[PDB]
Amino acid sequence: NINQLILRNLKKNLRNYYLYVFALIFSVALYFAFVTLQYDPAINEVKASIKGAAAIKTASILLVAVVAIFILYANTIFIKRRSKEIGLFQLIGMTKHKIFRILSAENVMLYFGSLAIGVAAGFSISKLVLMILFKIVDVKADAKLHFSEQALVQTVIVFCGIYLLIMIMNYTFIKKQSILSLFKKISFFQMLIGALGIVLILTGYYVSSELFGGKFKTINELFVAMSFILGSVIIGTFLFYKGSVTFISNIIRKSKGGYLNISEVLSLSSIMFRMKSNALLLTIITTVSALAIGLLSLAYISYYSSEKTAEQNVAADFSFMNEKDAKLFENKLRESNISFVKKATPVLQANVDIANIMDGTPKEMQGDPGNMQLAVVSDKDVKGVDVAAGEAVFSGYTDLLQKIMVFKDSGVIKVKSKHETQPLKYKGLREEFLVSYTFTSGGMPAVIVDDSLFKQLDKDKDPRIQLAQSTFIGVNVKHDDQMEKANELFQQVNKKNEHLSRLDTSAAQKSLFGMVMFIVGFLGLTFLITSGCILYFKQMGESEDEKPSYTILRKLGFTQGDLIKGIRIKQMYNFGIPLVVGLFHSYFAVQSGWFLFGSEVWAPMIMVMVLYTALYSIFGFLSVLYYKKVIKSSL
Amino acid sequence: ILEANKIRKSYGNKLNKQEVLKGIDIHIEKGEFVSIMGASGSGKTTLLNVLSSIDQVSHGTIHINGNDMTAMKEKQLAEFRKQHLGFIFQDYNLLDTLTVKENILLPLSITKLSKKEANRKFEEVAKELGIYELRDKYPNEISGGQKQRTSAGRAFIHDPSIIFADEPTGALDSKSASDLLNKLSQLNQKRNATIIMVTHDPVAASYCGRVIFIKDGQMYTQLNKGGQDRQTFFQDIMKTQGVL
């Protein structure tokens, strides 16, 4: 008789909880794929700055730290829902050992029958993960791989170790169970709680707005401000659920008086008394979702703007530091049938005073305003502008600089020469770049003076701040051709790799940020699935705890087709409030961190949030699909 | 309004048939207070259930305000049941998370009358019953008869054609039941609204104008009262029940 009961319980549990099995299979497959990827000797072709074989080692630990927490938490609701089932057995008369055996004989099957499918599905995804990684980064081809038995051993060990914790928790719950265990107006403290919940979030956003380019600038001071913001935005979010949605709901309710409708009764009866109870799980979900979305968007901004940052760093397609290597390169190119447009431009490093052109504070200095290092070039070299005497024109854009080094209008600029000072005035700012980042210090634009003025500036040549090479030998290229062979020739030219190329600088950044893209994307998809499953499981109690309200509404004249709409518009708010809060957090976190990872934004942010919402709506749909069943059986 | 013509129902569970309704002829005009009573295992409850739209029919024809109901569609039947035929139940059937005003004004949400006409009509309906003081008290602090009175007020909001009462005074003391019956009589005399009640208490049938003594699906005639004193009619009903 026991076997029939166990089989029936297993069949019943395989139907109510299937997302649990799906999550188990997905997690096992991903962990096996990551371990196989790490231990395989084939990822050696992907390297930009980090080794890669160690990044996967770190990414294979956070996944376990998330999956184990998910399992150990979601396997508590299951044992709590069996509360009014052990008392009946105790009344009938059974030793606790028999009850423990009955409970475990089902979990053993339901766990191992999924663990034996998760591992067997790792083969189909092992090659696809390599394909995705090799498509994000640039690499030639080919992937063969083998069994990698170490991955099987590690996965089996970990997912058998978790089961012992599950079993000890279940045994502790069974022993702790009681002998049988079978038999409002608004306050004023919540006023203060609701006020604080919004005030803290708003002030955190406002402070985070002026983090960069603000009144405070010190490596030992921005840490404190960051900690204060990251504490405020969390305390406010926590207080937003435990005593701040009740205020808004009460204000909404005390705005219609009497006449209402079934579209609002369920929401105004359930949201206030249910969101308060769970005001620690929702905080964690919102914070982790915001943290994943922000990191993904911040990585994708850099991946998008790498191709322009590389072109901005070096003015031409090739840069050189010595004449010997430049002439060797052109001699090699001579018989390669690839004609080059080579132009040279000397640079005279000099310093001036830009104190009067500051719109902000001396704190935003990045160098002494009166003795800041700059670069000076003549006017005959430039083929776009023809300046005159007593005129200085800037160049470049440097979107980061405009947010920090704000420039005023025309004024007086003092030349800090050896024993003279010729004053000029600021004409304007160009957009193109003329000198590579080697000769222009960090990011300071170079100045352009008149040819006549340069005729004495080069004669002076104050030898105190002059660089090793006061020349900009750079070999450009013709119209579009095979630049790959040109890059190969350039690479074989510099054995000591002491020069600069556009393609290499672009590819390095692309690979380095693509690795983080892949890791964070997979580690965020796993958490999305986990959070959706947890929320769907938590939504199951409301169905069984609200039946003696549907059974009364249906006896007043209402039909199922009229209750289903109210259920839909209640589930909309229930599944949408945390998502909206997380989106707001992510948006106000990204907006304080751009203009530093590169160039364009509003391209990746929407492209990430749209995908996140599209992958998040599924569990919201499934919750309504479940509510339909209990609605149909209410009568 | 009501017109029952040989409405009959057979109880069948695919293996046994035990008919309980054999021959019904009810003539009800607009604006009376009739009652159905008799025995304890008869078909009076089934008669009330089949007269309304809460239960289907087997053999008979029923016409309410000229409309056809015996062969009428299910969705249209639900629409008609929502539009008319207010109901008073044996139990309270009151939602706990709302208040009195919402509880008795919710069934008016389907037909949108804005936030002016409904608020004007609620005061008129609730002041006749004397529950205007109970406008924001939740239905867990008020007494017993006030919940039934709020249910009656909910049933009296949308001005229905026929009101079916299934044992209103079932779990109330004498004073509350008498007050509720007097208020129902006053509401009947104020606005023309037919009320049908099924009760086991002779005092409840005393306030009525006509009473039908059902007997295992038969007629056994009926009383008429009319120009008769309340107490004398009470003893007449007591004698008629004693005959049974």
Add this chain to the structure above:
Amino acid sequence: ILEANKIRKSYGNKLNKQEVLKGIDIHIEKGEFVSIMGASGSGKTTLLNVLSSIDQVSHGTIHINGNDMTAMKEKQLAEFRKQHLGFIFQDYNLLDTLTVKENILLPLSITKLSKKEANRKFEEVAKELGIYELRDKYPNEISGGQKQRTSAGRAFIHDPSIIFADEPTGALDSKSASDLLNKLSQLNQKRNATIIMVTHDPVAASYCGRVIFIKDGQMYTQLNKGGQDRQTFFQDIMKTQGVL
């Protein structure tokens, strides 16, 4: 059957100690329907735990069929409770994945009993309670009243004598509660069994004959009925409860 003398329960979690029960004098004979009324905050659950031997007693003497509860150990207490006690709960706590026949017969199959007499007992119980038609159905297609009757039938598969019962009419409407109370009423006129009932709504207690009130332990008096007509008795209970 049972005798309650100075029934007291102890407490004392951390500092505060609660003396909910301060001695009771309950004398109940064999084969009668007894109901214990009260009010919220009277600790009726603690009283049920003390009398049902689920919670270990602290003071006073309780005798079950002439045997003191404390005279046996824990395992012997469980065996005696299984042999001579049943239970009826407010909820419908049942095995969803078990049929009605198996759910009723589950407590009986443990003690090494042959199938023939078990089937005979199930037949007798189902015929007495009139639920034999749902012999091979499931609890997922059965109304609340039939589920409660199935639970009650399970409570009588091995004949108790001091069977307890919490409020059965907590999640039931009027008709189902009336039917269940009626069935329990004719079940009392059969083989004697104490059916101590701890409901608080006077409608449920109207079918009793030994209504007992609790304010501190017995401050209010008690009613005996005997010759009343189940309506004057109910009115008397309502009035004397309204006195409080």
